Design an enzyme around this catalytic site. Sequence first.
Site, PDB file in Angstrom:
ATOM      1  N   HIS A 354      15.402  -1.810   9.299  1.00  0.00           N
ATOM      2  CA  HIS A 354      16.509  -1.227   8.565  1.00  0.00           C
ATOM      3  C   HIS A 354      16.279  -0.986   7.091  1.00  0.00           C
ATOM      4  CE1 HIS A 354      19.268  -1.728  12.014  1.00  0.00           C
ATOM      5  NE2 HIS A 354      18.537  -2.801  12.250  1.00  0.00           N
ATOM      6  N   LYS A 545      30.427   0.571  -0.677  1.00  0.00           N
ATOM      7  CA  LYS A 545      29.261   0.039   0.022  1.00  0.00           C
ATOM      8  C   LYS A 545      28.931  -1.226  -0.767  1.00  0.00           C
ATOM      9  CE  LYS A 545      27.370   3.861  -1.150  1.00  0.00           C
ATOM     10  NZ  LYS A 545      26.504   4.446  -0.084  1.00  0.00           N
ATOM     11  N   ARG A 546      28.101  -2.105  -0.219  1.00  0.00           N
ATOM     12  CA  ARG A 546      27.753  -3.335  -0.928  1.00  0.00           C
ATOM     13  C   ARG A 546      27.171  -3.011  -2.305  1.00  0.00           C
ATOM     14  NH1 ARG A 546      27.242  -8.133   1.953  1.00  0.00           N
ATOM     15  NH2 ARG A 546      26.764  -9.080  -0.083  1.00  0.00           N
ATOM     16  N   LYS A 551      21.437   1.063  -4.701  1.00  0.00           N
ATOM     17  CA  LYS A 551      22.509   1.975  -4.313  1.00  0.00           C
ATOM     18  C   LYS A 551      23.032   2.706  -5.546  1.00  0.00           C
ATOM     19  CE  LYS A 551      23.975  -0.653  -0.272  1.00  0.00           C
ATOM     20  NZ  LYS A 551      23.721   0.184   0.923  1.00  0.00           N
ATOM     21  N   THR A 653      25.422   4.764   6.723  1.00  0.00           N
ATOM     22  CA  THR A 653      26.341   5.130   7.805  1.00  0.00           C
ATOM     23  C   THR A 653      27.677   5.513   7.180  1.00  0.00           C
ATOM     24  OG1 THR A 653      26.550   2.729   8.054  1.00  0.00           O
ATOM     25  CG2 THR A 653      25.462   3.942   9.845  1.00  0.00           C
ATOM     26  N   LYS A 657      30.590   8.492   7.808  1.00  0.00           N
ATOM     27  CA  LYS A 657      32.028   8.302   7.947  1.00  0.00           C
ATOM     28  C   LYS A 657      32.787   9.265   7.038  1.00  0.00           C
ATOM     29  CE  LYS A 657      30.948   3.421   8.552  1.00  0.00           C
ATOM     30  NZ  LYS A 657      31.051   2.313   7.634  1.00  0.00           N
TER      31      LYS A 657
HETATM   32  C1  LIG Z   1      29.968   1.643   7.195  1.00  0.00           C
HETATM   33  C2  LIG Z   1      30.135   0.315   6.351  1.00  0.00           C
HETATM   34  C3  LIG Z   1      29.093  -0.126   5.532  1.00  0.00           C
HETATM   35  C4  LIG Z   1      27.736   0.649   5.377  1.00  0.00           C
HETATM   36  O1  LIG Z   1      27.865   1.656   4.324  1.00  0.00           O
HETATM   37  P1  LIG Z   1      26.667   2.406   3.541  1.00  0.00           P
HETATM   38  O2  LIG Z   1      27.304   3.132   2.448  1.00  0.00           O
HETATM   39  O3  LIG Z   1      25.896   3.132   4.589  1.00  0.00           O
HETATM   40  O4  LIG Z   1      25.706   1.322   2.819  1.00  0.00           O
HETATM   41  C5  LIG Z   1      29.296  -1.190   4.700  1.00  0.00           C
HETATM   42  N1  LIG Z   1      30.497  -1.837   4.673  1.00  0.00           N
HETATM   43  C6  LIG Z   1      31.517  -1.455   5.487  1.00  0.00           C
HETATM   44  C7  LIG Z   1      32.808  -2.273   5.466  1.00  0.00           C
HETATM   45  C8  LIG Z   1      31.363  -0.379   6.326  1.00  0.00           C
HETATM   46  O5  LIG Z   1      32.435  -0.005   7.134  1.00  0.00           O
END
Ligand SMILES: *Cc1c(COP(=O)(O)O)cnc(C)c1O
Lengths: 812, 812
Positions: A354, A545-546, A551, A653, A657
Amino acid sequence: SDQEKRKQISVRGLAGVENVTELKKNFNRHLHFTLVKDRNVATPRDYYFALAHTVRDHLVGRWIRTQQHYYEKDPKRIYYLSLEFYMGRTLQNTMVNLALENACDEATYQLGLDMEELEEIEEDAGLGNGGLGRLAACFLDSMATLGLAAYGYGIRYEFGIFNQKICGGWQMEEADDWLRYGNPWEKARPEFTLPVHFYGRVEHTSQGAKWVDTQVVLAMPYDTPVPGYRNNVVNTMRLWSAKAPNGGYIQAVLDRNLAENISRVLYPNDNFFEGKELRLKQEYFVVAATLQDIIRRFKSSNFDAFPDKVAIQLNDTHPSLAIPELMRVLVDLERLDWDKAWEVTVKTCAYTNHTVLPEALERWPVHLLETLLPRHLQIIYEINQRFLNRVAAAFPGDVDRLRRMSLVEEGAVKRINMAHLCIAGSHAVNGVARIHSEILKKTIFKDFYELEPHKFQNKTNGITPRRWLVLCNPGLAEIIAERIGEEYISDLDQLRKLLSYVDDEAFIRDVAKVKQENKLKFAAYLEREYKVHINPNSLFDVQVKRIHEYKRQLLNCLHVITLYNRIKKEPNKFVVPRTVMIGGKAAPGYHMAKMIIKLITAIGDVVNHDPVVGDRLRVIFLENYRVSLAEKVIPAADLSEQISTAGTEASGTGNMKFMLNGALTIGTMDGANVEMAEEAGEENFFIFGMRVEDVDRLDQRGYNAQEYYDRIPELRQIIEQLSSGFFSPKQPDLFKDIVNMLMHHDRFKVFADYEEYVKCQERVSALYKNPREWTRMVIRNIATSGKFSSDRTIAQYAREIWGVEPSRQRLP
Amino acid sequence: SDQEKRKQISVRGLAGVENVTELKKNFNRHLHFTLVKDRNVATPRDYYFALAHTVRDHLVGRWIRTQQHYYEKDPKRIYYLSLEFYMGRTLQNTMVNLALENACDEATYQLGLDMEELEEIEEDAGLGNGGLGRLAACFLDSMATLGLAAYGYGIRYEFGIFNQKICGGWQMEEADDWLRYGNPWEKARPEFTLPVHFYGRVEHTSQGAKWVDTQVVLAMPYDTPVPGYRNNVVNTMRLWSAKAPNGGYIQAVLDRNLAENISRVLYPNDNFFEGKELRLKQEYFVVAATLQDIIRRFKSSNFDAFPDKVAIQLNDTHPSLAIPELMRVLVDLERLDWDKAWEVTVKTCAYTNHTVLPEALERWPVHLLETLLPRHLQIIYEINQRFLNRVAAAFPGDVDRLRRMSLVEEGAVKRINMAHLCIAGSHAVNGVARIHSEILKKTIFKDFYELEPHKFQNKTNGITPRRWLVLCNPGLAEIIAERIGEEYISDLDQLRKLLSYVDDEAFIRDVAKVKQENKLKFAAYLEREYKVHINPNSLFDVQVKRIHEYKRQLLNCLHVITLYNRIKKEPNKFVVPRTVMIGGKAAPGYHMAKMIIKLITAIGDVVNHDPVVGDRLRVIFLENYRVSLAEKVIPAADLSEQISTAGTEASGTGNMKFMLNGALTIGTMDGANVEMAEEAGEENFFIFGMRVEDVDRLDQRGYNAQEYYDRIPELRQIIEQLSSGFFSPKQPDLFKDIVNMLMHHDRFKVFADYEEYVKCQERVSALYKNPREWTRMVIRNIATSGKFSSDRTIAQYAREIWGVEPSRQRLP
Ligand SMILES: *Cc1c(COP(=O)(O)O)cnc(C)c1O
Ligand SMILES: CC[n+]1c(C)c(C(=O)OC(C)C)c(-c2ccccc2Cl)c(C(=O)O)c1C(=O)O
Ligand SMILES: CC[n+]1c(C)c(C(=O)OC(C)C)c(-c2ccccc2Cl)c(C(=O)O)c1C(=O)O
Ligand SMILES: *Cc1c(COP(=O)(O)O)cnc(C)c1O
Ligand SMILES: Cn1c(=O)c2c(ncn2C)n(C)c1=O
Ligand SMILES: Cn1c(=O)c2c(ncn2C)n(C)c1=O
């Protein structure tokens, strides 16, 4: 008679036929008998539970029928091993997939209750840190929907990812006590409790090796049902719980807590390796138990056929011990010859990578492995010797290659490279996005790709259109439905047909109406729950995102400060109003991530209270970002921030979304951004900055942040503001560590993408000024998001790795 | 509409009308929907749960209706505070009290299942050590049956009294993980969770005193239903659970275990005080939470009326902190004047003493109380000052009396006498048996009895005829029923009418038939579960109760060795065959009790394998004695051993159980033995040995065990056997500590009752030789056991302490 009288005991008749009358009847039954309560003293949460139990009852018949089915038919079984399953809430998803959402909605209406209010009582099953954990969850849902005999195996954490609170502008962690009022979804299974061994030693008797003198910890499994989309398939997610086996008597009883601590908390590290022994224990725990249950099921309807009936998929290297453990069992316990056992193991396991960042990969010191898992270390050394023997015969004389490919990493602290163990022991290793899979073959796994090219594949990530569209965006889902039907829900590629409406004034009006409704709803939610006021007529710029350096939330910070500085510069010049939202959690011990959250709130403190700025720019930090918050904020987003440094974000991911919910993307050519731009057409995307080859070139000659600082006046202004205490008056040097990193230790070249990013943002606001054109470009995105549905990803894993065929045929 | 639409949500209709058809229907429903299982994979335990849930459903309507009733009517409420509730199993008791036992029995029959087998799956709720804890349980049952608004308040221990195992003849303790597969009886109530404070300090502000800087621990209540006997009354037992409120993040989450450790284990000490801080925490925990819930209920339908609506009964001094806590709340929080608050407190509380042995009474060091409960110690000092002020005015000049009555015990380690705190703060102090209550007034509480004679009362203990007859001895209950009806079940005095059958050949034949059936069943149980063979045609001599020096199992040991020695002496001389059974647990740190268990098994090792002894004498130790084992072994007993040293056993309750189930009693004139002999007539009893005045006389001149050793040849033989290693060949001196204690440090004068005991045992076997006469004397016992039903005890507490009237009027 006798045993023929037990035929009466059957699932035969349930709560009826799935309608309002029987639903109310059952809600009532549960409220009194299950909650031992009545209407006079029932609390809102009680009502939430009543509804959840009523809904769960509808799962049982299917749940039992599905497992019976797999037993009868005996298909090859797929085991998804992962230390995380970010499931979020279950109520709505269950209702949606069972087609009970409307009935429950009406039933609760006639009982004078508000289902939406009740759904908010349920808290997230946050047994995941981020992408990797959510992917497992989307994958469970897709495998069910695809009719696969799939089982999700993990750890039942008592405490999921901490709940984040913001105090004084900083993140404060709080234990996530999600099981406090119980969990209406899980069903313990005591009879399947299993023993897991630790420490001990190894003695070599006549026969072979023996693992003796071990400490035992029991593993009790809890089953949660996972329903496919309207196909009557309910699969299982089995999560193991730690139980002690059976200074004085009192202390000895209190010390039972030590062995049960194994399944206590989810390590909150996203993309970062921490070699804590407790983590290694959790990894072995889930592996040992899971493998025992898998072999049991295999024996109950010799091992030559194991790979034909079993598929073990490793979500990262977390459950990699499954490789030596499977060997231990086959050689030590089942007495199979080493090589035959090895053949079996490789044919059974497949590994998924990953990330590519060194700090995120697992390298366990051997001393930790020899004391905690003595025979596993012995088996790993033997796997290594035989693997190195093969490369030596394939590349005679190449001693350095041997050293680079070894499972053992020499040095001060000898360590075991888990990723290498996985490649040696899996028949398939895969990246999670086309660009990521290619980088693997050219960089970190290059030596391995040269020795076994057949092994390496790509499986671009996906998200489930159920939770991520139908569920979280009913408005969008309905308008899409009125034009093309509902077959897209399990055939996302059909969204393509929406291109035919790119010039349809009705659809164009509808897409924008739905988006503004969501923006209105989200604003209402923020004011109610956090007393935060946001302008609904602004462009929702969102980066959730985290919190990470890779990032680049920091890059986003530089931009909002630029927006503010430009406004102050020319106050009377018109600018597209923006509400910039940044949310995400920082791992507890990640200083820089904690400094970034503080900078974001610090910036807001200045920006949000400047009278000359007013309604034109608002910067807010979305507290406690989790799956349920994602379902709320993403459908209300206009601009999706996906700005990781090219080559760092393996796939992403959240990006998918945002695209599926009507947001336009501003990002780099990284991870799945590349494939999303390809699907919609780069003309419908907002790609900017360096490409992988560009950062590589910069690396070859050296990255000098001072050059960009010397050459960009606007950038210099911001750093001067940061350093001087403009965003931290009371503590002038508060952000010195951020500045220092940016200026001299930035591994992610933020300064190098600043200019292009700002300009690209200008073009985003230029397009937003034209609603009709913004909306039409949104349409071209949603209409091409189809390839990013986890159903597609899963169908590829099935056919190209597991060797099983997907199916949408319903069960009775 | 709207809120009128919620009227549908009602208990109105349940699982029908209480018959076989609907019962099967519901068992099935629970097996599939509650256990998510089907007939093909359902395990026996699953079936046990299915049945339990079906039965519990029948409790709900009544449970809700009863609490609603108390709210509507608002009667004075009785709160039974205790740190123990030895409830044993609930399934059968619930069925019996709801009159569902036969229906469930038939329903499970038609479903091809065996209810008896299923009932054995349920494990004991052993939240008690012995008498005191069982009494609470019998009391809950009687208060329900008597229609009292009573609430049992305690601690929900994760681990009850340890499960005892015998290895190598010794006791081995095992954690009692009774909640492993869940508890179908309890119902958590999150909304009633309360905060409990510890440590901190006290600051005196303008207003008054303030308890600040405290550590908080939450108290989550779990409700268990307690059904009266066929009166449709279901009362509640509320047990509190410890929850943490909300070195790094990981360790901080793992450390939540520290605060939740409070409700982890029940201290296994029976009649012994251990001043461990964790125990003090448990005591304050149950008190603080319980009092908050009591005041809440009081405020929800000023404090002058508190005593008219509240009755707090202290089961021993364990929950004595309720006195200073109630004052703390009234003075500190409710701002009432000290004296008005004090009046309220005394009128509300009443204390029950259960022993007279010094080592069993609570004396908490002040240093422990000042750090853990600073303001409680301050309030205790003020209660003391004002109490001593009163005695000084009532007995001017008597300074030593002041010193003896002080709540504070001076010395090396200053301590607080809890018993004294209870007497000062209760309007009623009571002993648990006529002789015990009298000793209190003459010895330990003499000074207090002189200052406030009105305060002291007696409330002779009892046992519930439901669990202890109807439940455990259906055979006896039926034959008694065929002669006199069923009204005795809630009017035990009616058993009197059985005297009219003392010369009835049918009844005499029946009583003996029932007893031999039980003896047969118990023998079958022992061979099946422990592969222990016992002669069913022998006299079952049984002594079950916690292992203690004061209970004198050792005296019983001396007798069985005498029986063996006499047989070896005259092998061909006839002796009434005996199966001597001794069972009970020893507290972990009680050396002598552990030595006694070992001696018992040691004796058996010799006796049970001597060919010349054969079937004539068998000595066995009943492993893991608990409430459920009591229900099995007591109904099969012929001779009940109740041989405590006169004046040591405050009352005893097992003695009553044995009498109610057809066993003849051999015992001293101690505790309730005195009143049992009075009820049946000493001619129908086997009383022996010293009387209280006799041990007192022996104490005045000094107890010299050597005198009895020098004067009794048979006694000398046994001690010589013990010392020489006759019962411990491989370790000759194994019992030296037992011998040494007996010879020079016996506080319970075993040697002094040896001769009379042996002779009295001779007369027991003389009577057993005549079945008809043995049976007729048994009849005269059972027929006079009526005064020992907890319904009588409770009715006295109600009318003489609580100030409420009992009632057998049924609810709809
Ligand atoms: C989809 C999801 C992630 C992953 O997000 P990225 O921007 O791809 O790093 C992280 N946290 C939550 C709560 C998510 O639903
Ligand atoms: C005997 C074959 N299985 C089957 C038909 C199951 C079933 O009826 O499950 C329903 C209650 C949800 C299920 C199963 C079996 C025994 C106890 C508990 C479960 Cl859950 C499993 C499993 O491993 O989970 C099966 C398997 O394969 O071994
Ligand atoms: C409002 C009056 N009470 C009543 C009618 C109860 C009831 O209907 O209980 C049924 C569900 C078993 C009961 C109660 C109230 C609220 C939440 C949970 C319970 Cl359990 C209690 C209590 O303290 O336990 C009551 C009380 O008195 O305050
Ligand atoms: C009744 C009971 C007791 C109390 O017995 P005594 O002989 O009065 O000391 C102890 N243990 C259990 C399991 C009981 O049922
Ligand atoms: C340097 N560092 C950390 O120290 C860290 C982390 N995640 C957690 N921690 C503790 N990440 C992602 C990181 O880069
Ligand atoms: C001396 N002693 C103990 O040491 C003891 C005990 N119960 C528990 N312990 C530890 N009893 C009853 C006792 O007399």
